[PDB]
Amino acid sequence: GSVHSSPAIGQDGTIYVGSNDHYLYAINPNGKLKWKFETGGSVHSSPAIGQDGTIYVGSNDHYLYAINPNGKLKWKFE
Amino acid sequence: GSVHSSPAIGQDGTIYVGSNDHYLYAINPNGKLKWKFETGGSVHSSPAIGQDGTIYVGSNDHYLYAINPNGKLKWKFE
Amino acid sequence: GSVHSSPAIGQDGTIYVGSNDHYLYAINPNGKLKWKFETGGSVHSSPAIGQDGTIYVGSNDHYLYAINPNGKLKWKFE
Amino acid sequence: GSVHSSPAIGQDGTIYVGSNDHYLYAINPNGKLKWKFETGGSVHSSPAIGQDGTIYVGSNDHYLYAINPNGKLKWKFE
Structure with missing residues (x-):
C-alpha cells in the first residue's frame, strides 16, 4: 500500500x-x-480543489467528502 | 484497495x-x-477532463470511457 | 489492481x-x-505532459519513459 | 504494485x-x-508542485516531504 495520497x-x-x-x-x-x-x-484518493477552494476527497468509509478551506465539513456524499 | 479514485x-x-x-x-x-x-x-482510474468538457476514465472492464458532460456515453475504447 | 492509469x-x-x-x-x-x-x-503510473508536449510515464519495467507526441521514443531513464 | 508514481x-x-x-x-x-x-x-504518491516550485511528496516512511527545487530538504511533516 501507500501511506499518503498524492498532495x-x-x-x-x-x-x-x-x-x-x-x-x-x-x-x-x-x-x-x-x-x-x-x-x-x-484516504488513498488524492484531493481535488474546486474553483471556490473546496477540498474534495474520497475515503474508504465509502463517502466522498467536501471540506471547507477552514477544515469544517461542507457535505459528504454516499 | 481504495473505494474512490481521485476526483x-x-x-x-x-x-x-x-x-x-x-x-x-x-x-x-x-x-x-x-x-x-x-x-x-x-473505476480506480481518476477521471480526466477534455477541453470540450468530455470526461475520460478507465474501468476494470478493460474499456477507456469517454462520457459526455450530461452523462451519456460518447464512446468506449478497448 | 487497476487496468488503466489515470488519463x-x-x-x-x-x-x-x-x-x-x-x-x-x-x-x-x-x-x-x-x-x-x-x-x-x-503502466500504472498516470502520464504527465511537458510544456513541449512530451509524454512522460513510468513502467514496471523500471524505466521512466519520455515519448514524443508522434509515439516515437525520446529517451528512457533508469 | 507500481515502481513509479505519476510524474x-x-x-x-x-x-x-x-x-x-x-x-x-x-x-x-x-x-x-x-x-x-x-x-x-x-514513494508511491505522485509529487505536487507549489507556486514557488517546492516539490511535495509522501513516503511510506510516513513523512510528507517538502523538497527545494535544488534537491535539498525543506522540511518533513509527520
Whole structure:
C-alpha cells in the first residue's frame, strides 16, 4: 500500500494530503499543520480543489467528502 | 484497495469520481448527484477532463470511457 | 489492481492512458487510436505532459519513459 | 504494485517522479538526472508542485516531504 495520497496545492500554497490513518491533512507551506479532518477510513484518493477552494476527497468509509478551506465539513456524499 | 479514485473538477465545479462499485459519479458542488454512469468494473482510474468538457476514465472492464458532460456515453475504447 | 492509469489530456485533446497490458495509448478525441507505445511492464503510473508536449510515464519495467507526441521514443531513464 | 508514481512537471520542464526504491527523482527534459532525494520508504504518491516550485511528496516512511527545487530538504511533516 501507500501511506499518503498524492498532495494537492491550494491558492495560498496550502498542501492537502490524505493518509491511510483516516485523516485529510492541510499543511501550511511553512511545514506546520493548518488542520486535519477525521474520516472513517483510509484516504488513498488524492484531493481535488474546486474553483471556490473546496477540498474534495474520497475515503474508504465509502463517502466522498467536501471540506471547507477552514477544515469544517461542507457535505459528504454516499 | 481504495473505494474512490481521485476526483476531477469540471468547468462549473462538478465533481467527478470513480468508485469500485463500477460507477462514475458526477456530483453537483451542492452535494446532490448530477448523474452516475454504469461501467462493467471498478473505476480506480481518476477521471480526466477534455477541453470540450468530455470526461475520460478507465474501468476494470478493460474499456477507456469517454462520457459526455450530461452523462451519456460518447464512446468506449478497448 | 487497476487496468488503466489515470488519463492525461494533450493540447489537441489527445487522451493518453497507460495499461497493465504494458502499452501507453494515445487516443484521438474521436475514439480512434492515434498510436500505442510498447513498454516492458504494466503502466500504472498516470502520464504527465511537458510544456513541449512530451509524454512522460513510468513502467514496471523500471524505466521512466519520455515519448514524443508522434509515439516515437525520446529517451528512457533508469 | 507500481515502481513509479505519476510524474509531475516543473516550470522549466523538470520531471519529478517517485520510486518504490525510496527516492524522489528530478530528471532534466534531456533525460539526464538533475538530482535524487533519499526517503525512508517507497514513494508511491505522485509529487505536487507549489507556486514557488517546492516539490511535495509522501513516503511510506510516513513523512510528507517538502523538497527545494535544488534537491535539498525543506522540511518533513509527520
